[PDB]
Structure formats: structure tokens, C-alpha cells
């Protein structure tokens, strides 16, 4: 029960121990730092933390039995600078005292624990990414991580789920008691950087079952996450992103008031060792209020994007004859043709970052018009994808387990420093 | 006015000639003009 014995989190622009053990904790300027307990680390020589444990109690007197727990938000790789990213280890959080301890490092795609006994002798375990996949559910966007330890085996789970394993029976006393210093250190670049969120350290192995509550705790929020993990904005700009056509996105049709569906450009240049497909594309949606900018769920909004000078919103016609039709991308208006109005929505109970986007007859109606998605339409006759309303989706989206790949379900890109392409 | 014009071709986008034509004759446009631009 009273397993935690550091829990570093934010107050009054500041980081504390909340564990109750007092650790000291010294943030240096050079850390920023945010309400959304988040904090990064620079490059700069002040960027960083030094915790100072509590130096009259041992956790591990006997045997080695203590878990960390974090999220982390690691910037996508330069195009220009692979080799570096590939090949430069750099540590992000060391914990050393007479050349034994643990410490946490990063390099290019893979992150890594590493636990040093007092003979020396050094097991590592780590979770690496694929920097290949058309669209990656790690690169920059907040994931959470958990490492355990017993006298066994060395665990990273990452947003509750087992990753890796390493034996670490051979392993001997690790020296537990040395100063937390949150730090890049390594041949970085200049512009290198990594966020994270909720660093916890506990003093037992955690199971995977208590790893997966802190998991959907940690995730819980009242409101919307965009694309990167962040809380969704009133008043800002995003590409969107539709989670059962991730490699399709949404442009304007040419002399049309519709939103023709194409596919992503990839990366264009010439490494074997990445692909993505590009993200800021298609048209810049803007999401407007029908105290605090954050969407939440069930609010009303209007769905907006920029058509070149003008904001245009997006429409549901009233009275479209079959399941599903095309939404109507127009200027703002009144019109009592159309529906304007879209309750923003959560029908995944399990952590996500996709939304959906309801359109309702009206607000203090339970009249359910239909789920903004993707549809195929046949129009030489050819098929066509289309920015859809679809009725199809209201039952859809109420089968438990909820499916993460309807095209009801969308993420909002926004321009993000840790994503260049 | 240029929303009017919008909504016709939206409407001609979804098939519905009917609509289209209805919302041409109320945005404006000549009767046999609007057989054109079907």
C-alpha cells in the first residue's frame, strides 16, 4: 500500500516531493515547466533537477523489489541528422552513487534502463520504437512507461502493456541511495529535448495490473487530448488525422464545397533507416466555442477551417436521403438548410487520443443526426472518398470493446517543434 | 449570395437536381439559366 517513495510533482511553478519522505528537490532555471505537470529538459547547461533522497532510510535493505513510473514525449529524429539520432546515447535521469545505481537513457528510438551493482556489473532492458511505420503511435506523442525490478527480472511495460524482460539473477547489491539528477548528458544536439510527466518511483515490483490502473488514471481527464497527447484547444490551429484511414486526410475540393479524401506524401528523401508518412497536410482546421481554452467532452463546437483568407465551417445538409453523404464546406452561416452544430465526443472508455464529432438536430435535443467519418462514394463512374457524415457509426461506436480503427475516430494534429518534415 | 451559389453546387455534388434547382430559383438565377449550370 504505502509503496511510493518518490512522487515529484507540480505546485506553484515548482516541482515537490509529495511522497513524504522529504527528498529535497531543486529545479534550476533552466527546466520549464507547466500546470499540466510537465517538465523539459534542454539541452542548456540549467536544465535540470537534482533530487536529494532521504539519507536514513533503506528501501532494499535485503532484496532488490522497487518500480519507476513515467510518461515521456521524445522528439521525432531530424531528417538531416539520422546517424547522430541512431548512434548518440545520452542519458535523461541518472541516480549514482560510487559508480553503482540505475540510470535511464535514451538513443534515437530506443529507451533504456540500466542497473550498475557495486562489483560493476551492468544488465540493461529497453523498449525501441519503429522509426519505419507510416504512422507511429510513439514518435513525440506522450506514452507511458513502467520499469520493474525484482531479484528476477528487470520489466519495461509501456502504457501498461509488458515490452521486454531482462534476467538480472547474476546482479548483486545496487547502490539505491545517490542523488536523482534529471539531465540530458551526452553528444546532443543543440536542439535536443525531451518532456515528460509524473515521475514516480515505488519501492515494490509493481503487476502488471497496478501498472495498468495507474495507466487509465494518469490518462483520465475531463477533456480531449489532440494528436501529440496534449489537451485539445478552442482557437487553434490542426490538421486532422482519421484513425481508420491513417494515411488519408482531408482538402477541399477543387471548385466544390467538399472535402475530397487523398493520400499522405511520405518522406521523400533517401534513408534506409526511416519512413513516415507527412502530417501537415491536408486543410487547417480551427475548433470555435458555441475559463480556460481546453475542449472538453460533451461540449458544443463549430468545426472551422481556413479556405486560403476566409474561415469556412463544416455542415451536415438536414435532410440527406442514405446513410451517409459528403459534409458541405462553406462559409459561415445561419442557413436553415444545414446543421452547423457538432458535440465533441469520448465513446472509448479505454485511453486515447481519437475523438468523435456528433452532429445533433439540437442541443437540448437527444436527436442524433449522425458521426462525422470517412465514406466511399461512387460518382467514367469512379469511387471516391469522401468527409462523410455517417449514421452507421451512432451504433458502432456503443459496442464495448470500442473499436479504435472506425473512421469516426479523429486526432488533431498540431504544429509541434518536436515533429519536423 | 456566394454562399447561395455553394449550396447549389453542394447540392449538385450529392445528385438531388431538385434541390439544386429549388435553391437556384430562390438564390437568384433564371429558370433557364439554372438548366444550364446542371
Redesign the interface.
Known amino acids: 500500500l504505502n509503496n511510493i517513495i518518490l512522487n515529484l510533482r507540480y505546485k506553484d511553478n515548482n516541482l515537490i516531493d509529495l511522497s513524504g519522505y522529504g527528498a529535497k528537490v531543486e529545479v534550476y532555471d533552466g527546466v520549464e515547466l507547466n500546470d499540466k505537470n510537465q517538465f523539459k529538459l534542454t539541452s542548456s547547461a540549467n536544465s535540470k533537477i537534482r533530487v536529494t533522497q532521504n539519507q536514513n532510510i533503506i528501501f532494499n535493505s535485503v532484496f532488490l523489489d522497487f518500480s519507476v513510473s513515467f510518461w515521456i514525449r521524445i522528439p521525432k529524429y531530424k531528417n538531416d541528422g539520422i546517424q547522430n539520432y541512431i548512434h548518440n546515447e545520452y542519458t535523461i535521469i541518472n541516480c549514482m552513487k560510487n559508480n553503482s545505481g540505475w540510470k535511464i537513457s535514451i538513443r534515437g528510438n530506443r529507451i533504456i534502463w540500466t542497473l550498475i551493482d557495486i562489483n560493476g556489473k551492468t544488465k540493461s532492458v529497453f523498449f525501441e520504437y519503429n522509426i519505419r511505420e507510416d504512422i507511429s503511435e510513439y514518435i513525440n506523442r506522450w506514452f507511458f512507461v513502467t520499469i520493474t525490478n525484482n531479484l528476477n527480472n528487470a520489466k519495461i511495460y509501456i502504457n501498461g502493456k509488458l515490452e521486454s524482460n531482462t534476467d538480472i539473477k547474476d546482479i548483486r547489491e545496487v547502490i539505491a541511495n545517490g542523488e536523482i539528477i534529471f539531465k540530458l548528458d551526452g553528444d546532443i544536439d543543440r536542439t535536443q529535448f525531451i518532456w515528460m510527466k509524473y515521475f514516480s518511483i515505488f519501492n515494490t515490483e509493481l503487476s502488471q495490473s497496478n501498472i495498468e490502473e495507474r495507466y487509465k488514471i494518469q490518462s483520465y481527464s475531463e477533456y480531449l487530448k489532440d494528436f501529440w497527447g496534449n489537451p485539445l484547444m478552442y482557437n487553434k490551429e490542426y490538421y486532422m488525422f482519421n484513425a481508420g484511414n491513417k494515411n488519408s486526410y482531408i482538402k477541399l475540393?477543387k471548385?466544390?464545397?467538399?472535402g475530397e479524401i487523398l493520400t499522405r506524401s511520405k518522406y521523400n528523401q533517401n534513408s534506409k533507416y526511416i519512413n513516415y508518412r507527412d502530417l501537415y497536410i491536408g486543410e487547417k482546421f480551427i475548433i470555435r466555442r458555441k475559463n480556460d481554452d481546453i475542449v472538453r467532452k460533451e461540449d458544443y463546437i463549430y468545426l472551422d477551417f481556413f479556405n486560403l483568407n476566409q474561415e469556412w465551417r463544416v455542415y451536415t445538409?438536414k435532410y440527406?436521403?442514405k446513410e451517409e453523404?459528403?459534409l458541405?464546406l462553406?462559409?459561415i452561416?445561419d442557413?436553415d438548410?444545414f446543421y452547423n452544430t457538432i458535440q465533441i465526443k469520448e465513446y472509448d472508455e479505454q485511453p486515447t487520443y481519437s475523438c468523435q464529432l456528433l452532429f445533433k438536430k439540437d442541443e437540448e435535443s437527444t436527436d442524433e443526426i449522425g458521426l462525422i467519418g470517412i465514406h466511399r462514394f461512387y460518382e467514367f463512374e469512379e469511387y471516391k472518398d469522401y468527409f462523410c457524415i455517417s449514421k452507421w457509426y451512432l451504433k458502432e461506436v456503443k459496442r464495448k470493446p470500442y473499436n479504435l480503427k472506425l473512421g469516426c475516430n479523429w486526432q488533431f494534429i498540431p504544429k509541434d517543434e518536436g515533429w519536423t518534415e | 449570395d456566394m454562399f447561395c451559389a455553394l449550396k447549389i453546387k453542394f447540392f449538385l455534388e450529392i445528385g438531388d437536381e431538385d434541390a439544386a434547382r429549388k435553391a437556384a430559383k430562390k438564390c437568384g438565377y433564371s429558370e433557364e439559366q439554372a438548366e444550364r449550370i446542371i
Open positions: 475540393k471548385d466544390s464545397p467538399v445538409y440527406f436521403k453523404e459528403k458541405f462553406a462559409p452561416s442557413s438548410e
